[PDB]
């Protein structure tokens, strides 16, 4: 179990909006410790039974939450991400899709400098089966277990989740790092949290075309990851130089192809799988 657990108190920024409301009920029902939410101008009211604040700082005082989930539209996301960093939230989970690459580039710098952690943006979220759910993922397909998963794709995660629930293994914690070009946490940051997690016996690492986060992690894995790692890369049949849905999913200047990633994952001795159908199968081999 990494990042979150039964004890993590969470507030939601953009709490009174469509997605915010909906996915919060889902979290509340799953048992997640939503302690409240923020929507400027609606401070001093209740929504889904929790208190709503005008600013992230007032929320942090009144509740002492330490993580924030963001359901705020792209145009204002950078402001809200920085507001959280600045009210002392130590864990930020951003669902929002469409944040300008240049905004992330600046936000990333500030995250790292201020010691804050952010999963996202443009991601499903994070879940610790049985204890905590922050995100849009469907809670009933996971089961407390020993496999940890990091993925750039959300839906691909659900395939792997399902397989590992069926082969009976279960999951420690599932991390969706997002499909953007510059996320707040990449593979190596999450890989390393698993290596040090007792509850995690093996790791399922799911990636896709574009960028070099896979390759860089490969290199890291070889040298610092001891637990068994099974990886799958999506996008072998993808055309060059075209965004494939995800802003970060694009083969640019002939770099970041599905295959180079496989190749390099294998060099680091990772159990690659060519069909996402056999993810469960390969874990049986560990």
């Amino acid at each position: 179990s990494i990042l979150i657990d039964k004890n993590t108190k969470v507030i939601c920024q953009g709490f009174t909006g469509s997605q915010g409301t909906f996915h919060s009920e889902q979290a509340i029902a799953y048992g997640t410790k939503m302690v409240g939410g923020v929507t400027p101008g609606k401070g001093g009211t209740t929504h889904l039974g929790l208190p709503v604040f005008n600013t992230v700082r007032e929320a942090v005082a009144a509740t002492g939450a330490t993580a924030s989930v963001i359901y705020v539209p792209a145009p204002f996301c950078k402001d809200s991400i920085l507001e959280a960093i600045d009210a002392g939230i130590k864990l930020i989970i951003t669902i929002t899709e469409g944040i300008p690459t240049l905004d992330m580039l600046t936000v990333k710098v500030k995250l790292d400098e201020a010691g804050v952690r952010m999963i996202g943006p443009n991601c499903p979220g994070v879940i610790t089966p049985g204890e905590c759910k922050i995100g849009i993922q469907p809670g009933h397909i996971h089961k407390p277990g020993k496999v940890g998963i990091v993925s750039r794709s959300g839906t691909l995660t659900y395939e792997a989740v399902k397989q590992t629930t069926d082969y009976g293994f279960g999951q420690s914690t599932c991390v969706g790092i997002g499909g953007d070009p510059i996320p707040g946490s990449n593979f190596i940051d999450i890989l390393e949290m698993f290596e040090k997690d007792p509850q995690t016996e093996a790791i399922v690492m799911i990636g896709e075309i574009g960028g070099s986060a896979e390759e860089e992690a490969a290199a890291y894995i070889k040298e610092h990851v001891t637990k068994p790692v099974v990886g799958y890369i999506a996008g072998v049949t993808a055309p060059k130089g075209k965004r494939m849905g995800h802003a970060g999913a694009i083969i640019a200047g002939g770099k970041g192809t599905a295959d180079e990633k496989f190749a390099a994952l294998e060099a680091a001795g990772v159990k690659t799988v060519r069909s996402l159908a056999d993810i469960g199968e390969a874990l049986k081999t560990v």
Binding site: T101, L102, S153, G154, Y158, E159, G179, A247, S275
Partner: protein, 385 residues
């Protein structure tokens, strides 16, 4: 989002960067009248398409008479130009850029992009002007110099000079180059660009730096705050279906295969295309259903996939999502009967009511094959062809 050469040149002009004198024309008459507005010949005539390698395809020429200009214009306006960067259809030429010829002394390369790896906007300069930069980087990586904009301070002159000297410029060319680096770096930050490419950045025989060509890419995610750029979009350069899909919250990209795919999720969409490939199939398109798989949206997706005649079968693969599977199966049927789908449709549902839905599909009578799991569904469609 891409811009045309003439549009990038206009932008440079606004920020005071140097480009040759020119005029974008929509009629051969405009083209030929540009001659005398520019001055004495000869002149350069260039087709305006988003793709590169326009030279090779014969879309760029130097001519000597007004008649030759008219002739070029007549030859291309309204036609499609195929370069090694366009698909087989090529892109439609609707404007010819007619500019003054330049006395080239030396050809350089200046460019910038967001380096995913270092999480910075990186500028690259090289003396290997006039060559596709990816060749240079593979063969002679030591001939490409780079600097990275510090988000804290913004572009600084010392970085401009650094590159200037590594290229071996001296004198006034060092100043000129610095000023151009500063301009581009600013345009980049201010207009939310994703990519800049001046190839070639020329040193004229008269001793000045000038941007001969220009290639800009803007970050689509930022258009909400780039009103001017929004207006400059030229849909004529894209596969019309891509825009059409976007209106319906679908991400479409056509390929060449005969098996259509309708999946929800970019990763699952790419995964599905691959597993169909693994089992001998040929994916015909990538289509990610963004919105809820509602009847109307599913119908739309069918219309788009089937707009291509190479399609012989369609694989639907829907995992979870915010719509109960039985409702999805309902929509899939309406879609088929209303759109009039001829080819066989293989469906893989998963989540709430997956089994109830698979029954609805099977009892429907239509040529819908409810698959029992990913791999089966894969084999099924591959088989159907």
């Amino acid at each position: 989002m891409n811009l045309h050469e003439y549009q990038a040149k206009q932008l440079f002009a606004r920020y005071g960067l140097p480009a040759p004198v020119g005029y974008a024309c929509t009629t051969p008459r405009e083209a030929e009248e540009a001659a005398s507005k520019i001055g004495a010949g000869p002149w350069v005539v260039k087709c305006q398409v988003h793709a590169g390698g326009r030279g090779k395809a014969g879309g760029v020429k130097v001519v000597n008479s007004k008649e030759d200009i008219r002739a070029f214009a007549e030859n291309w306006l309204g036609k499609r130009l195929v370069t090694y960067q366009t698909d087989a259809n090529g892109q439609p030429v609707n404007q010819i850029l007619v500019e003054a010829a330049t006395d080239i002394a030396k050809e350089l390369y200046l460019g910038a992009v967001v380096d995913r790896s270092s999480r910075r906007v990186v500028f690259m300069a090289s003396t290997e002007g006039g060559v596709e930069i990816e060749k240079v980087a593979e063969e002679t990586p030591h001939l490409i110099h780079k600097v990275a904009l510090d988000p804290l301070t913004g572009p600084m002159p010392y970085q401009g000079r650094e590159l200037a000297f590594k290229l071996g410029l001296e004198g006034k060319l060092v100043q000129q180059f610095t000023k151009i680096f500063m301009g581009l770096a600013t345009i980049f930050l201010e207009r939310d660009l994703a990519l800049i490419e001046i190839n070639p950045l020329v040193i004229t025989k008269q001793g000045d730096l000038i941007c001969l060509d220009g290639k800009l890419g803007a970050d689509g995610n930022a258009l909400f705050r780039q009103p001017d750029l929004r207006e400059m979009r030229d849909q004529s350069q894209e596969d019309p279906r891509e825009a059409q899909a976007a209106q319906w919250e679908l991400n479409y990209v056509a390929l060449d295969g005969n098996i259509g795919c309708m999946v929800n999720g970019a990763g699952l969409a790419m995964g599905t295309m691959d597993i169909v490939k693994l089992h001998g199939g040929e994916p015909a398109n990538f289509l990610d259903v963004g919105g809820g798989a509602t009847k109307e949206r599913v119908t739309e997706a069918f219309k788009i996939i089937l707009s291509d005649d190479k399609v012989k079968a369609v694989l639907v693969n829907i995992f979870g999502g915010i719509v109960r599977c039985d409702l999805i199966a309902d929509g899939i049927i309406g879609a088929v009967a209303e759109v009039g789908v001829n080819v066989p449709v293989v469906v893989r549902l998963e989540g709430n009511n997956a089994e109830l839905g698979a029954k609805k599909l099977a009892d429907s009578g239509l040529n819908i094959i409810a698959a029992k799991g990913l791999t089966d569904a894969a084999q099924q469609v591959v088989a159907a062809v």
